[PDB]
Symmetry: C2
């Protein structure tokens, strides 16, 4: 009772929306099967007020829900016969005229778990299940969540409370919330999780030692029952820090042995350990080694056990416009294609910079046919409102996933790159930086729950529309009142564009306060060593990334996209300032001058934020008071901060451009 059930409400149905079932046939007794049966019992009891008896053999005359794998079937029907994916499943209603039977057939126990959550999802959404014929197989092998939780309880870039894993440099004593968290993750198909910050500090470095492994294993045991593999972010300098060795050089014989022994030790506690997430003071480059050498060493240590190495892909001068941070990732990793071991997967952010409200797609996707790749997206809203401002990230992620790289001609969308189909990747997928914390509503902003849900849905099937994902989430979280559904869906679907409207313009990004990264500060990092510049001056703004006159970044894309961005007239408006430096008077495809566009979206974005609040207020009475006010409080905070964003950006550019707002709206001198 300390936290919300999020989208797994299982609200009691009226007398006209019940189902008649007397038994649940559980064909297996595995740990996963016990959790799945429990979940099914929980949902049916809560929603239908029924308590079917769990049995292991079907009763020919009872209405039942059958749970099992192909191997448990008496007759293997054609549909489930086409399943090839281990986590896939089939759900079909028996077509006989006798007892009502629902068959949930999974290729493996994991498949049954996801099938049962799909079945429950159908019930929460009020779907007619009299004649089901469903087949589902996830597109991404890895559907992972990265936690930036520290063991002192803090969470790097965490805006939803303290960690639910650690406290006072120890694991929390009560694991009930970890179980409920596992349930939420599994309901949306998430099958992997790294429980600690990628920036591994002193105490966290010890997670790979006997001192903490027992607690790590207890947590992994919980996730295992929900089909989730556990990973740990590691400190590359561990051999020195805790091993006593004089070096961390991946080529040093003893360092290689140390990691092999460490791997062996971990698997003694966690037989199905997922592997290591790596952000590499000492490191590969510290010894003149490349990423392949550094990643392959860890890969070799985990190989005998089936573990994976997730290798995630800073003192540059603002004075030199020839150097471009956006080009770094590609320039550093592309040349390494083909040198990585099979169990190494390069983790690349959606964009080449750092999770800005809008960034073009990282050129690395589609550029390394011989190297597994998985995309990293940020669920926690570091540069997208920090859960103060509403920002449904699903539409943005779909734009990235559907981006055609043309790597192998038309039809080489990012999603085909990371789902492994385009290049036959053995291991690949997508990862998301957790947006949860100890807050009772899990995500700080009640509506941010939609981003966690949505992440899982896209990870399972990138082809799902933003519209249906929002619909599913709203209906399960707030009910089916058509006004509530339409209003909240509209809020979610338009939120990202609204936030972008009053923040950084036309894809140039940043313009945020340094450090905490919250709020407007146009020149915040403009003269820093982070390579994040907009180069705004009294005549124009933008980064010239063209080959003709700029950094040449455009050439990292394949011909079709390179030419699109390379040209000043074809470059889409939404990314113009990321690719070209232009005069304030330059006219966009929309007809607006760059400067007037800035004023327009900032004034209008605030008005759109006020509308978000107005529409929510009109739902009062149709939502419980607690959550109604929890969200209203944040929408009001959003409106007020949006005003600051608007005025600071408008004033900065009026002071620099000297050009007034076409409509004479209020710009403070």
């Amino acid at each position: 009772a300390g936290y919300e059930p999020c989208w797994l409400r299982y609200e009691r149905k009226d007398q006209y929306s019940r189902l008649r079932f007397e038994e649940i046939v559980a064909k297996r007794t595995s740990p996963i099967f016990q959790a799945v049966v429990e979940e099914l019992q929980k949902g049916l009891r809560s929603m239908m007020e029924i308590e079917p008896q769990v049995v292991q053999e079907v009763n020919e005359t009872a209405n039942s829900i059958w749970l099992g794998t192909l191997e448990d079937e008496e007759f293997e029907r054609p549909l489930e016969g086409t399943l090839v994916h281990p986590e896939g499943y089939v759900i079909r209603s028996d077509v006989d005229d006798g007892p009502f039977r629902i068959y949930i057939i999974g290729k493996t126990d994991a498949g049954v778990l996801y099938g049962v959550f799909h079945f429950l999802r159908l019930l929460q959404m009020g779907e007619n299940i009299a004649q089901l014929s469903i087949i589902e197989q996830p597109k991404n092998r890895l559907r992972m969540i990265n936690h930036w939780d520290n063991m002192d309880g803090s969470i790097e870039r965490g805006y939803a409370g303290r960690s639910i894993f650690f406290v006072d440099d120890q694991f929390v004593k009560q694991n009930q919330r970890i179980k409920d968290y596992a349930r939420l993750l599994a309901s949306v198909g998430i099958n992997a999780i790294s429980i600690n910050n990628v920036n591994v500090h002193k105490t966290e470095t010890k997670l790979i030692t006997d001192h903490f492994l027992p607690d790590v294993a207890e947590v992994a045991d919980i996730f295992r029952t929900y089909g989730i593999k556990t990973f740990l972010s590691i400190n590359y300098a561990s051999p020195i820090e805790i091993g006593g060795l004089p070096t961390a050089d991946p080529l040093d014989p003893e360092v290689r042995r140390w990691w092999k022994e460490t791997a062996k030790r971990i698997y003694q506690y966690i037989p199905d350990f997922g592997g290591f997430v790596v952000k590499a003071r000492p490191g590969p480059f510290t010894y003149g080694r490349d990423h392949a050498e550094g990643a392959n060493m860890l890969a070799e240590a985990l190989a005998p056990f089936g573990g994976l190495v997730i290798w995630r892909c800073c003192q540059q001068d603002w004075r030199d416009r020839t150097t471009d941070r956006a080009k770094a990732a590609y320039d550093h990793f592309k040349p390494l294609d083909g040198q990585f071991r099979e169990n190494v997967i390069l983790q690349i952010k959606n964009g080449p910079m750092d999770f800005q409200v809008r960034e073009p797609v990282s050129p690395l996707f589609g550029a390394m046919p011989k190297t597994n790749q998985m995309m990293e997206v940020q669920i926690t809203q570091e540069y997208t409102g920090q859960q103060k401002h509403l920002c449904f990230l699903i539409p943005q992620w779909k734009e990235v996933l559907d981006f055609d790289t043309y790597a192998k001609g038309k039809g080489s969308e990012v999603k085909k790159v990371i789902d492994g189909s385009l290049f036959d990747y053995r291991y690949s997928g997508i990862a998301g930086v957790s947006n949860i914390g100890s807050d009772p509503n899990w995500t700080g902003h009640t509506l941010a729950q939609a981003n966690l849900y949505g992440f899982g849905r896209l990870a399972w099937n990138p082809d799902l529309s933003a519209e249906e994902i929002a619909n599913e989430w709203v209906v399960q979280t707030f009910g089916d009142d058509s006004q509530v559904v339409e209003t909240i869906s509209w809020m979610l679907l338009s939120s990202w564009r609204i936030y972008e409207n009053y923040t950084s313009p036309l894809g140039v990004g940043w313009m945020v306060n340094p450090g905490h990264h919250y709020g407007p500060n146009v020149d915040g990092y403009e003269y820093s060593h982070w390579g994040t510049y907009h180069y705004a001056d009294r005549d124009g703004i933008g980064v010239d990334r063209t080959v003709a006159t700029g950094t040449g970044y455009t050439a990292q894309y394949f011909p079709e996209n390179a030419a699109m961005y390379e040209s000043l007239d074809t470059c889409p408006d939404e990314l113009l300032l990321f690719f070209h430096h232009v005069p304030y008077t330059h006219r966009l495809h929309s007809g607006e001058t760059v400067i007037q566009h800035i004023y327009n979206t900032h004034f209008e974005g605030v008005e759109q934020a006020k509308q978000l609040r107005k529409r929510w207020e009109q739902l009062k009475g149709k939502i419980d008071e607690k959550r109604y006010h929890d969200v209203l409080e944040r929408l009001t905070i959003q409106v007020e901060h949006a005003k600051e964003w608007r005025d600071v950006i408008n004033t900065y550019f009026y002071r620099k451009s000297g050009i007034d707002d076409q409509y004479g709206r209020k710009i403070y001198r």
Copy 2:
């Protein structure tokens, strides 16, 4: 051997610079007298290689140094007869033709302590003491040091290591460094010290309780022997935090009683407790009370014991140019003149903003004839280089001290205001924010030792020239080689102007990175709620603080100075942008346009910094290698950072003004 002796080196003299003394006549046995005798023995042994016998009665045929007060004299000569100040003293060589005798006569034991340090200073400097006739009396009653030390060991705005007082929320075990620190403070006449941060956190709030008072008293005992009174910064909400009371309202009967009891308890441990330093979550205004009501309540609690209350004198909008943070202090306190109790002293910073490289004098000085006032200066270089960049603060402090407020016509300089002579203040003086830390050289930058020394010297006598103070410090710290003395003195004397040259221009201040406040960031706080704006736009820069068209801040000064700043043509260049908003093309008294002035001082300031380094390098061999390299390392760090300051500021203003450098020097686009 863990730290430097700073200016109390007492270097061994050659055979041609010795003194013949067989006895030290100590007329008293007080704790202070034991320390003074010890100091005299230390200096004479170290410098002269002599060990005179300490006696209590003069030996008619022995060469001796006589120590005592008027009361101990056989014959009271006219000079010491004119002494009126308790801390004053006279030093005179006997004019007889028999044994050589030096008489150090203090009005009180404290006077003898300062007289002995003056005598030792004469010896270190190689002065002829055969015919001394000296009389000295300090101008300021309060010559205090404020520590911003936290009990966890950190020091707010501390750039010279960790605190030498606290560690792990406890007092340090070894007090030898506290004793040596007391010696340094006393050598320059400092007679008061607040040992904890003005921002009192949780643990520090307990310093006024039995839990810590024993340790506080042990520290106070040490300072007492060196003529230093101990103060504690307090948490105004203490009645709630540790008292259990439901309020902190200074008018609440119980709150008034709580503080009276707290005072009584402290004096039981520290009979000569100096009092409280106060920076006032709950506070006077929290209950609708004014500063007088809040300060008088604490004053009444300390009154029966002779204690003093040092009352030190944030969400404004950048959009409203009518509101001016510079006017706040004066507007809030002036109206309260005459309502404060006698033992309350208002502590006002040298400037109305926040220790910027250059700020005009706080109008409060000379504006409250009925209220004791003491000026606060910052020795730690928060906005003046953070001991990375050299910055001898003495010249700046003299400009403030010598500023004529004309409060009572010509001759109403700030120094006469704070020394209490102008308004007959019973308690007043000056305070400095400590620049020391656990670093072996005490101040981070070896040469920053000069700022602590210089602070004390000015506190004693504001009339001392920057030149002689530097001379004294250099000679005692580095010897009398004429090249060393001339070179280091030049470095110190020109350092402030050099740093100002490449930082904020013409008195507008700031332009520093937010948070740590180190380094260039022109718009760092430009759109913040701190009221620190320069309003630079594509046409000009500056804050209009005139009465005619601006905030009206100029009217806070008396007529003579108000008119000077009010006028665009008479306003001195060095403060122009603090008082007027002007076009980049405006011509200064120097003939430079405002924009060209910016380029000039920034390019030239870096060249001046390189010269500081070059001149120091030429001293190699004349300074021990340790300190030679300690300083060279910092001068090189200064040169490199100065280049960043230069380029960032020049680029920002070229990008905004569009006006090129007259001399075509390198400005990055």
